[PDB]
Structure 1
Amino acid sequence: TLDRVGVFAATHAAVAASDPLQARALVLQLPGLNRNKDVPGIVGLLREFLPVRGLPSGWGFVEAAAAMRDIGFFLGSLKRHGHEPAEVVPGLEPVLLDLARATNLPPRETLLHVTVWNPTAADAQRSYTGLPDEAHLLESVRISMAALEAAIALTVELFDVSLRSPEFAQRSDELEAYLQKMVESIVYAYRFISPQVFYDELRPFYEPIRVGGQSYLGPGAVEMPLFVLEHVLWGSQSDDQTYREFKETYLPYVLPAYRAVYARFSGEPALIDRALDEARAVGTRDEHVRAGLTALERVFKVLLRFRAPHLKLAERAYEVEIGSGGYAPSMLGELLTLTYAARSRVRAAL
C-alpha cells in the first residue's frame, strides 16, 4: 500500500549499515559503563575509536553520519553524568565540527543518528542505556520516519494540485494514509514504554551540550520533520510567534532538504489557504472541490489523532521540567489548539 516508504528506508539503511570507525563492539560496552556511572571509563572507551588525525579523506555523507552516530552516544552519556563532553575529551570538539561540516547537520547526535541511522540487530544497535524501554522508544520512531518523509513529498506535490481536479482528493487520501504511521507510533509508545522508566532512566540522557560557543539540543522525536510538513500544509503564514519560534528551533536538526522545503514556503500562503481561497472562488457545487475538502479534513483528523494522544503520553511522563526539545508539555497544548483551528477552517468551508 505505502509504496513510497521504500526509497526513504533504503537511504537510512545505508547509514545504519556503515561502521567507518569499526566501533560496533565498542559502543555495545557503553550501557554497562553508564549503569556504573564510570565517567573515566566512558571517556577511555570513546578514545579507543575517536579519530585523532582528522577524518579519512574518502568519507562521504554516509561515513561521516555514521561516525557522528557512534561518537554521539558518548555525548549524551557524558552530559548525563554532569559533564560537557568537549571539556573532558580533548580533541573532541574539532572532530564534531568536521562531522557537522561533512553532513551539513549539527555537531552532535540527532534523532536521525540514534533511530533510523542506527542498526537494529541486538549485536549492533547502539543505545545509551541498553534498556528495553529505550529499544521500544527507538522503534516508535522507526515506525513512522520514512512514512513521514513520504508524506512531506506528497504535501509538496499536493500544493501544486488544483482543488478542481479529482487528483486533489486522491493525493489527500494518499497523504492521510502515510500520516497514519504517526498515530501508530504513539499507540506503540503508549503500549510499550513505561513513563516511569522514561523519565527516570532515559530523559537524563537527552540534555543539551555546548559545542562551538552554543548549545545544541539532545535527540528527541520533536526533531522529526512533521513541523516542516505542517508549515507547508497550514502554518507557513501563521502570525503566532510562539509557533514560529517552535518551528525555527528544530530547523537545524532536520535534513538539509527539509530546511530548503521550509524556506521555500515561508511567508507565502499555506496549502490550505490556497485550497480554501480556490473553494471560495469556485463554489462547493463543484464535485471535486467537495471531495477535495472532505479528503483534506481527513488529513487534519489524522494529525489530531497523533497530536492529542501524544499530549497525554507526554503529560503522563512528566507526571513523574521540559523535554529534550526545551519545551514544557503546555506548548503541546498550544500546537493542538492551532491544529483544531486549522481543521475548523476546513470543515467550515463544507
Structure 2
Amino acid sequence: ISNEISKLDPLNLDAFFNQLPSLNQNLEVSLLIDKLREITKSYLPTTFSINDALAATRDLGMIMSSVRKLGIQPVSAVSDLEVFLETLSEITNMVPRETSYHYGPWNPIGERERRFTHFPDERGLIEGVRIAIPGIELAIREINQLSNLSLNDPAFESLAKSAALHVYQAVDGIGETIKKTDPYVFSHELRPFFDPIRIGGKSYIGAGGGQIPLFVVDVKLWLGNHSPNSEYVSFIKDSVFYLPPELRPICVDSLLEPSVINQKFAEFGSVEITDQVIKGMESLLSVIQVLLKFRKPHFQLAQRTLSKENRGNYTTGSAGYTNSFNHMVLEFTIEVEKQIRAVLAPY
C-alpha cells in the first residue's frame, strides 16, 4: 500500500519539496501561498484515484502546515483550498490534512522525501513512524485473531509471538528518534510544523506520533470496554476517524467488546491449565512487555524535550496533551504486566 503512495507525485511538487526547507528557513510565506493558489487552479481533484488523493493530501497538507507554522490559517488565506480539501477527503474518506501515515510510510525514501526543514533531527521523527506503522498494522491483524483461538492451541502462542515481534518495530522506530532528534531542536525547530489547522469549521490537529495505531493494539489487547470514562478512551475516541478507514471497524468493535486479556484471564481460570496454556498466557505477557520497551524510553524522550530547559513555546504534543498522558498510558500497561504476572505466579 505505502510504496504505491510514496512513489506518487500527483501535484508535481517534487522540485518544490527540494526547496521547501529553504523556503521555510527564510520565512518565504508568499511562495507557500502562491503554491497553494496554483494547486487549486491547476488540478481537478475529483479526477483523482484514491492513491493520488492520499499522496496529494500528504503534499498539500505539508505546505498547509508550513503556512500554519507562521501563525496563518492557510484555508482562511486561500479560501479555494476548502472545496479542494473537501473533494480530496471525499475520495480518501480521511481527514483533509496529513497525518503520521502521510509523513512516515507514505513519505518516499531518499531524495524525494518530504521534509519541513533542513535539520537532520527531522529524519528521526520521519523514520520513527515510517518504521513503527507497518509493524503495528501487522500486530493489529495478528492480535485480532487471538479472540478466536484457545490458550491451549499452539497457534495462539505463535500468533502472539508474531505480534510481539511486529510491535518491536515500534521500539526500533522510537530508538531511531532518540538517537537522531535532539530534544531542544525538536521543540524549537520542528514541533511548530504540527499545529492545528481549521478546515470547514473544524480544527484538525497536525501529524503526531500518537497517530500510529498503537492505541488500536491497546484496545483489542487490554483496554477493551473496561474503563469507559478514562482520558485514554477520550483520546482514542478523538483518534478513530484519523485512522485509515481500513482500521476503524477493528477499533470500534474493540472499544465495545471485552479485551483479549480479560477474556483470556477467564479461560485461564476455567480450563485445564496445561503447558501450552501457560505458553499461551506468556505470549500475551511478551507482547505487553514489548509495548513497555516502546513506552518507557518514549516517556523519557518526551520528558527531556518538555523540560523547562528544552521545551520552547510548547507544553504539549501536537494532540494537545502533556507527558502526564504518556505517564497514564504507561502506568496502564505496567498494571497489565503486573496482572498477568500474578495469574502466572503459581505456575
TM-score interval, normalised by the smaller of the two chains: over 0.9
Return the offset for 1:67. Answer: 0.9
Separation in structure 2 between the aligned mates of residue 171 and residue 128 of structure 1, nearest angstrom: 39
Q: TM-score, normalised by structure 1?
A: 0.93
Matched, 1:253 2:229: no
Q: What is the one-letter code of the residue matched to 1:314? A: A
Counterparts in 2 of 1:201 and 1:173: CA distance versus 1, 3 Å? same
Return the offset for 1:45. Answer: 2.7
Residue among 72, 83, 99 paired with 1:83: 72
**Corresponding residue number in structure 2 for 1:40:** 30
| Mapping for residues 1-350 of structure 1, pairs under 5 Å | 11-51=1-41, 54-57=44-47, 59-122=48-111, 124-239=112-227, 240-284=229-273, 286-319=274-307, 320=310, 321-350=315-344
Q: How far does the alpha carbon of each residue in 1:26-84 deviate from its partner, in whole angstroms, 9 at most, with x for none? A: 22222111111121221113333344563152x21100011111111111111110000
Instruction: Assess if the C-alpha contact under 8 Å between 2:96 and 2:199 holds in 1.
Output: yes
Instruction: Assess if the C-alpha contact under 8 Å between 2:124 and 2:179 holds in 1.
Output: no
The answer to which of 258-267 and 211-220 deviates more is 258-267
Separation in structure 2 between the aligned mates of residue 251 and residue 304 of structure 1, nearest angstrom: 23
Separation in structure 1 between the aligned mates of residue 337 and residue 205 of structure 2, nearest angstrom: 31
Separation in structure 2 between the aligned mates of residue 174 and residue 191 of structure 1, nearest angstrom: 26
Separation in structure 2 between the aligned mates of residue 325 and residue 51 of structure 1, nearest angstrom: 32
Instruction: Assess if the C-alpha contact under 8 Å between 2:164 and 2:290 holds in 1.
Output: yes
Separation in structure 1 between the aligned mates of residue 23 and residue 202 of structure 2, nearest angstrom: 28
Counterparts in 2 of 1:26 and 1:282: CA distance versus 1, 3 Å? same
Q: What is the one-letter code of the residue matched to 2:269? A: R
Q: How far does the alpha carbon of each residue in 1:229-260 deviate from its partner, in whole angstroms, 9 at most, with x for none? A: 11001111222421210111211211111111
Instruction: Assess if the C-alpha contact under 8 Å between 1:52 and 1:91 holds in 2.
Output: no
The answer to which of 61-70 and 237-246 deviates more is 237-246
- SS of residue matched to 1:324: coil
Q: How far does the alpha carbon of each residue in 1:81-104 deviate from its partner, in whole angstroms, 9 at most, with x for none? A: 000001111311111111111101
The answer to which of 128-137 and 190-199 deviates more is 128-137
The answer to which of 41-50 and 97-106 deviates more is 41-50
Q: Report the count of equivalent residues.
A: 337
Separation in structure 1 between the aligned mates of residue 279 and residue 79 of structure 2, nearest angstrom: 61
Return the offset for 1:154. Answer: 0.5
Instruction: Assess if the C-alpha contact under 8 Å between 1:85 and 1:209 holds in 2.
Output: yes
Separation in structure 1 between the aligned mates of residue 46 and residue 23 of structure 2, nearest angstrom: 29
Separation in structure 1 between the aligned mates of residue 342 and residue 155 of structure 2, nearest angstrom: 22
RMSD between aligned residues = 1.4
Instruction: Assess if the C-alpha contact under 8 Å between 2:36 and 2:81 holds in 1.
Output: no
Instruction: Assess if the C-alpha contact under 8 Å between 2:211 and 2:239 holds in 1.
Output: yes
Return 5+ residue gaps in structure 2 as ranges. Answer: none
Instruction: Assess if the C-alpha contact under 8 Å between 1:19 and 1:67 holds in 2.
Output: yes
Runs of 4 or more off by more than 6 Å in structure 1? none
Instruction: Assess if the C-alpha contact under 8 Å between 1:12 and 1:116 holds in 2.
Output: yes
- SS of residue matched to 1:28: helix
Instruction: Assess if the C-alpha contact under 8 Å between 1:76 and 1:207 holds in 2.
Output: yes
Instruction: Assess if the C-alpha contact under 8 Å between 1:78 and 1:85 holds in 2.
Output: yes
Separation in structure 2 between the aligned mates of residue 179 and residue 265 of structure 1, nearest angstrom: 18
- SS of residue matched to 1:265: helix
Separation in structure 2 between the aligned mates of residue 23 and residue 107 of structure 1, nearest angstrom: 18
Counterparts in 2 of 1:51 and 1:135: CA distance versus 1, 3 Å? farther
Q: What is the one-letter code of the residue matched to 1:348? A: A
The answer to which of 24-33 and 197-206 deviates more is 24-33
Q: TM-score, normalised by structure 2?
A: 0.94
Instruction: Assess if the C-alpha contact under 8 Å between 1:22 and 1:49 holds in 2.
Output: no
Return 5+ residue gaps in structure 1 as ranges. Answer: 1-10
